[PDB]
Amino acid sequence: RVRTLANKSKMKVSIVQQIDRKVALDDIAVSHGLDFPELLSEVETIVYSGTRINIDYFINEVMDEDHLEDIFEYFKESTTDSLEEAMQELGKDYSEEEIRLVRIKFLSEM
């Protein structure tokens, strides 16, 4: 009913557990009453904390393999992981959502 830091903390644990069980990210979003970009923001929070996740099962199903390869190469060769920088370089070809997803994979693989 009202967000608290404890329920936010528990939600993130839940999202991780769902990702481990290979639940589709869009299904996870619905399960928590989130829009897709809101879910991406939680997953980014999770990844920033150093939590090891793996969303290949989802990326491989929904994304164009060439888009994935080219966005990933951009991150491999980049100096900063910044989304703003990635949009400046890649935004003429790829959406924010594609770039955010591959960025999650890239940061998670550190």
Next chain:
Amino acid sequence: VRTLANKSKMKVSIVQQIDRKVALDDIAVSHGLDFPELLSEVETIVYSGTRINIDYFINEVMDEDHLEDIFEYFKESTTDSLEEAMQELGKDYSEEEIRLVRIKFLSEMAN
């Protein structure tokens, strides 16, 4: 009037100044920039792939334990984001200290 040509030239000059070990605050003044504006230009340079070394300046102006703690933060971080660094470090270190060490770290690890 700023143009893409004279901005590119200014950056070339900044890189040369840093190579010649000119203090960053002196570089700022020489280009009519305030310090944070200079930091923004040095960030642009580093993002582009130029391996600059600003140890001579950091070692002169920054507290040694501050440098080590912030550097360690970046080494252990997942994202290099300034926003995340500020959330994690902003109660102990200034934005300028964090930006300087982040330049050092990004240049070393990538460029």
